[model samples]
Target: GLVPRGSHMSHQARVSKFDLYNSDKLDAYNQEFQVSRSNIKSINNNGGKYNSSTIDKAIDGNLETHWETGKPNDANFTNEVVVTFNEITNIDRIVYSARRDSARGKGFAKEFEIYASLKDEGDDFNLVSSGEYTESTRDLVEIKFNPTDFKRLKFKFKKADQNWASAAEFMFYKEDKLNEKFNGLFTDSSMNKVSEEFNTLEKLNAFENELKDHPIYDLYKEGLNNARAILTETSENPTKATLGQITYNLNDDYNNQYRMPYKNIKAIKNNGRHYAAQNIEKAIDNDVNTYWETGTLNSFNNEVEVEFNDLVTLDRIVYGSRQSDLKGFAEEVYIYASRTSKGDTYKLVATGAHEATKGLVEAKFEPTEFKRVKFKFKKSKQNSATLNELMFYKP
Candidate 1:
């Protein structure tokens, strides 16, 4: 039904409150758990002290002759022992000798429990062992259990109403299946823009051949190409002129080269782009806009200011070039740093000016740790110039 012209729908604000309870509040929140043990290996030939706080064999075992005897207790057991392993696998087991039988050779009967779970740091010694009583009079006991890719295993003495009690030896078995390959989307925000360019089919084909084996081949394959239609206009240049927007894909040899394009910069206000190629050479006669006009010896005083809406932590800038016979050229370049919150407005972090007819230039930085840093081209004697790439790294 329609309401009267001036009559408003009765607006009633309501707030409801109910007793809410969550059970898995303290449980693992779908995360990979790993374990670690202290270093018990002897390097000085002196008997290395055993760390009892942790229970990982790789960390505490093989440290000394504590397990050979009846009671493998370490004098340094006062502190909670710790163990950590760089890696591990699926099947896990623990074997220990009865402490009572080893220490005093008196209490020797049967029945015990073992515990294991994904490795964790904050929740130390949280997963207790399952209470499984076993009666095997044999001096040695082997308890086996199955887990879904676990590295850290803990053991506790849940002595049943039996006798024997002591830990003798422990070992871990694992099956690692790790794929260190990169097959995901990767975007470098530090670069004002990343692009590629080529003139000839042969040159493009050669570049594609190289991309086939590049580390980022997979990333380039995923919709990066934007399927931009190629456009060309013939000119005096011998090579055919072609132009189009580039996508993330890098199959077309004509494009796919990692390029850094710095558009209208605020500091320099130079509406130009930089082009750099890794491991290649070009003729200096080739048109390459340069900013540094006057000199090149520690020319860091010159810097331009550019605001990056999508700011990213960076180290430095890379300036690639073609092999040129030009009289004035530089193999490397410097990317000054941005001023800090205080002190000098800007500082220097990374500098990469590789001497490449065409190659990659990597500028590194240290913003305390790795962080987005701002910088600009130093004042150059020349005004019109181009930068192949403005990139950063953890070097």
Candidate 2:
């Protein structure tokens, strides 16, 4: 069979499509499926609501709009979204189109997993399918599996192509349905490249002069228009908007016993790979715009400790709200203080919660002098949490 034919080459380097997937099921090869997208009851996520990229946009049955995560750290960010059906449904294929923008699919999923569960919300969510999609330039990425029945599907993404993630469309294709036309891996002529040059206000401010002086400034400023569209078309920063309810002006009436000479603050568990500006010290800083964020979903380990070289009497600990809605908030809190040292044993001093309220929250305890204080956040509405300012006050 390896012999050469007349005027024909032998021992070819090219392989057949069957070799890529399964050679046994030749019928499944080079075929397109027509799956229904109408069975979805609801979809939800704990990801960012950046610009017009909310979770609903992904399942809106439209490819023009997409869901995008708020700008997150590229190195380590866990983004998960769930889709629940009105009734049990059988699915054999899942398809996706990365966010349609200037950067293309820059922040699309690099590594991801899919899970199925019988319960809408519970600990029984089990992993079913997982794979990596590397072709960012491709218009659509498809994954096929054996038909399975489930009430809910959870798509958990670990790493992203960039520091963000987006979805132009996410489809839970029906099993056993064939498309009328072949689904080719080609992009449309009108595909847009999303600009990532000036997603931040500071970047736009810094380059205002540089862009104004350049020739063909109008063309160059289209990138700035993208940023404007993001800010103007979207809702106010969710976390910062809640600060409007913060009635406490926090004047200089009470004694602030929160300061120390050294780097005296720590989150027992924080964003493992955090930016230098978001270090544990931000919580202790006197700025509400800056705070500490524990990016991981590990809420139980969300404990923050502040130590002082000398003992200071404390009656209350304030958990200030972050200015940006992208940051996290402590919903349920527990506070403890140790009289000895930073590593010494401690006693439970106070407990409090920050839910449905804004601005700042406090955990009050009896006046006690201690060298170290620990604030443990038991739960958060969002897995990640931020405390703009953690200060101690005494009456």
Candidate 3:
């Protein structure tokens, strides 16, 4: 056998210094606001067949247990379940999971509808959503609609493949779409938008000049060095898993991603707040996939101006469009160069029309030095004029 190494090699590795890192930082917690099961005071259902399992099993918060109608297989029937809550609840989504313990298809609904009422017994319930699902063993299915407040809710299983409608779990959710802060871990499904934003830190930092003044730079640098000093030889992309404690908290405005920062640009004012996620700031985020939309029908006066921190010379303005049915593509656009952000102090630089394709449309003009550049959409397709990525360059 080969001999053992020297005393230095025999010494154990150090674990004392890594107390700063925690697994909680590695996997972000679920922050969705789901109503508690205990809030469901009662679930009363119309008998479809022989007396079956109690309805409370659906809200037991366990997928193994379920509420099943005692109806026969492939027998058509209509069953309605009314759920009374302890207090008036506001919910925009209803989540339901059919019994998935074993592969039995009889308990799945072919069609369903949801109704909401504001009071215990006096107020009449109004229909909220109607939908259909086919699988009994599939994951949770959501019936989403506008946020409605209710003290009592009703679920009508209008039709089912079989007479039985079984529920492994039923849930209510309120997606108020608050601006949440989350630094998520993992890159699956070729990365969702959140994980993709995390990967951007590496590339953004690759060019020192691009992100020097950005607020994200310091934390990114700190996270990079944390593992470069520790497991320097083990990880393929060490920063992906390491330093969440030191670097991930900068996402204060959005959930599951790092905050997009602007370095070269100053304030950007648009017509109105179109969407919370597609805010005006995203117009110049340099990330092509993220975009800013007007969210209303495009108009001739729907203008957007990008102001620089200083006077910058650019020869070209490039705009990218994103939509289905070519909805938001700017058919006619006018580019104006201005020294002042307000009033008619603008000089028309170029006017062009973008084809009805989701590609970058370029409007080239003679090199002009200006502090503010405005894009006025003279005409657009039916929907809002969306700017997926608006960029300025000398070339």
Candidate 4:
């Protein structure tokens, strides 16, 4: 019989305390206390030190990029920060908080690379990913890896050689789930007996061959095959689901996804003073986006395709002129209906164009059944492509 030796482990009962040799000498505690108040120091939050406490933490890939440059940072701009880990180990994930805002950084950064590796080593990390943007604003890029160990990690940013500088935020995180293992029985698809029943390449092949005839396997393959077919068709220029244009008869409360296009308007108020229609009574009350820029994208040699949703009807579209009395800008506007959906947007909806060279330019067409519409300037003398309000009317 073995004797019970519970009291013999007395050495494990003694605990030791970790002494802080020089913690108070360094301002570690004071620095942490100031973190929350970093951004609130000035009247405007510009030129303030970032609060690491406010920065996102401990997530796989979460980021918030703040571009101080006012506009989206353009392509090929290099800016970075050095990160020191709490403990020396391997890093598995990185999250970049950036903005693909307009301005110089139109769409996406043309070219740049972000890196994480050991500091002072001969060669630790290589480039991970780099490219330009061909999408809309607000983007998230993710990377995955198996858990390996490292002591130090460096955050290196290199701008492209032929693009502009775009600055945004940068943060890093460590993902621990990558270091997991499977609890299965065999490496290959061996038999259940584990008694040397399924061995050799031929046996594996024979087992796979048997699986091909199984009913469940067929269903699995069929489901996968159907998914592939749907995906193939769906990915080919699928028509987006949108509420074509916001009208007076919006039933309940449907979310607004796309913004209204530019058009001729009687007047537009940036401070939400004018009640236009729908929930778009005032421009500033919404997302602060008003289609009042007269100069940008004004002249269109190419046609502008205005898309609406399934349950939408339009009688006509309105364009902008200077204003009434030909004061500031001309009210000279034109409208053409699109028949050929692909080639020439609209059929000839109306014969003559409206030339209100001073005020709201309105185009009245008989209500027709059409989901998509286009507004061709036909010919104009407005220096800037500007419009204020787009009014939709029906019986």
Candidate 5:
């Protein structure tokens, strides 16, 4: 067994000096308003002195050096510091950091006011902010206001915790375009111009550079690649190109399949004879009153055919059975498809069963391009097979 350590793993750890303020600096609170201090044009320190307490040190991106005013008992109560920018700046958010004082919070401000103006030192200054710093928390004070354009801003202190006012840092920020729509650029005609220039590699490279770091860049590249793939597969009039209008689109065919336009299907091919009242053409006629009646079908002998105007992807097929009564309806059916107009490459795709009382029976399969489809009545319930109507859909 291991020997026990000294005095229950030593005299226990010290908990008396846990400085949560220094360990958990509030820097993680918000980083969106962190702008560079290079935007500052001028500064006024008023009565503040010493290289360590210079007014410019407050915006030097460091929390150690600060701007400290004279002791309250030694000088006037009113103290002010002014900062000017190179241009009239629009600022929506501001952050102020209090100096980290080790001895009795001697230099923290107790009350302060903020003023803004287009001029540097005229009486045109307007009071824009007022606040009280009650505690020596050393925590950051964040102020949000309506963004106004100003050439200069002033920080005036009326009271202090211990006769002196000091600050670690002051930060100002303007709105960035990352969160706005398309980074505040692009119109309908501009987008149309992009479509026209997409074919040229040089134009595409320029677009990539312009949209660098944009949220929609990846989606834009993916759509461009998809269009390129479609163009490579087609051989029609190559030089004169345009985006084909997609009347109906399908993402996939097998698992999460969807239906597309079915208007191209023309008619059902002529098969053997049908029961006089239940003509075979009735199945394709769109009228539910009429039906196709197979006199009687063996296990899988009876067949009906449908023809399409052009080769198209097949997604699913639906068959409606006799609804008036349960006399003669298909019990089981199998579906086959072929791409050739001559009908030499037929392949089975789906199979399902139906009931006379049930209105419709639908079957879905992997999307396969075909020009014709054949429905085989594998079995029937009442020694005969009947279909009210049928439809074919693309994927």
Candidate 6:
């Protein structure tokens, strides 16, 4: 049967509505770039006694204290509280914490308008948002809109839940436009144009020189170092480099003298009951406090395995036993390696016992081609096995 043209419109409309609902839920969970109240330059308070400086409490990074207007008998008297920042900033959302938990709900803004200004006077001021947000007590009211750039933000209260408008905290957030742009340019793309622009050592060195005296130099410095690591690790064509692969190639001779990209390797194990098999990466993360421990005391054959993204030739492995405990230290370890992932074909490479103290142990064997490596715990000091770190390297 031939398909009707307009019949598909109903399905498309439903998908669009679902997408809108999902995006709103996502925004409620994602928050970034909080503006600190320490940046507040000055405040113009309209009412209140012995609490003229209470406005500072709203942004003091505390939740217990709050700022409220004078308990004027006239509920119709609107209060205006203007807060000024030391520098201009871009803000898209503001969070308002009502002071309902204090003093039996004495003060809370019922209706309010938010305004933005670049100057001290009325000439540049403009209303950004206005709403009537009366609802349950002790709840947070979040107002989101198109982002605005200004040095001053004003909160004008038109009505209050009681005698005054109270706010326990006022939080501001700025849009992460730089990271958004970076993701758009690099990730989710078939090819990265910027990576291509400085794909070689010569070009990257030149770009690093040019970045000197640039206004955004600090922001781009770490990115440049990462780019260098990527270019160094790549053979010729690096169009489809994965993040894990980039980490593997970042092992440099100067800073990371004996460190390998163990964190970038894929980890697997025999049972889910044992120390979370997925956290085997922690054993190579260089931190001695974090470790991978077996669940059972008598599981002497407990094995942790790793697979490299590409084939490598190596002659040495360095490891550290669990620093915090000694019961799970390996008494003897059997190391195996394989170029293929097929069963029963792994060849034994080395065997050694770990140090009793929280120190390092090294195992060296003839260099060979391998894409996979494994450590089978032969015996432990106290029946169970544990390791803090495992690193592979070339001689």
TM-score to true structure, per model: 0.23, 0.36, 0.38, 0.33, 0.36, 0.36
Ranking by TM-score: 3, 2, 6, 5, 4, 1
Highest lDDT model number: 6
Question: Which prediction has the highest TM-score against the true structure?
Answer: 3
Q: Is candidate 4 or candidate 6 better by lDDT?
A: 6
Cα lDDT tens digits, model 5, 1-395, are: 01101110021111111121242222331243445577788888566654457777778877776777643423545777788988778875556665765543455555677778997668688877666656443666544444557789887766765656677777776543332222112223112112344445565456556655543344334333322332233221111111111212222353234443346665664344567678787876666677888754554477888776666786666666666774456566667766544313356766665444555555556666656788777666675667776765555
Give the per-residue lDDT of model 2 (tens digit) for 1-395.
01000110122111111121223332233233334566788888766768767889988877678888875644455778888988877876677767777767765766677788887778698777666655453356655555667799887776666657777777765543211011110111111221244345665455545545332234333334433333333321111111113324255433333433234443333424344457677776667777776645543456777766555676666676466673467666667666543222466765566563457666555665556777766666666666777776554
The 10-residue segment of model 2 with minimum total lDDT is: 1-10
Candidate 3 displacement at residue 380 in angstroms: 46
**Full ranking by lDDT:** 6, 3, 2, 5, 4, 1
lDDT value for model 3: 0.56
Evaluate model 5: give its TM-score.
Answer: 0.36
Q: Please give the TM-score that candidate 6 achieves against the real structure.
A: 0.36
Error of 3 at 6 (Å): 61
Clashes of 4: 33
Error of 5 at 263 (Å): 66
Give the clashing pairs for model 3: none
lDDT of each: 0.29, 0.56, 0.56, 0.31, 0.56, 0.57
Off by over 4 Å in 2: 1-35, 71-76, 177-395
Per-residue accuracy of model 4 over 127-178 as CA lDDT, tens digit each:
4433333342234432223333433343333432122222343333334221
Report the C-alpha lDDT of model 3 over 83-159, residue by residue, as the tens digit. Answer: 89999999766667667666444465557777888888854878877766544335555555566787988887777
Two-way lDDT contest, 3 vs 6, winner: 6
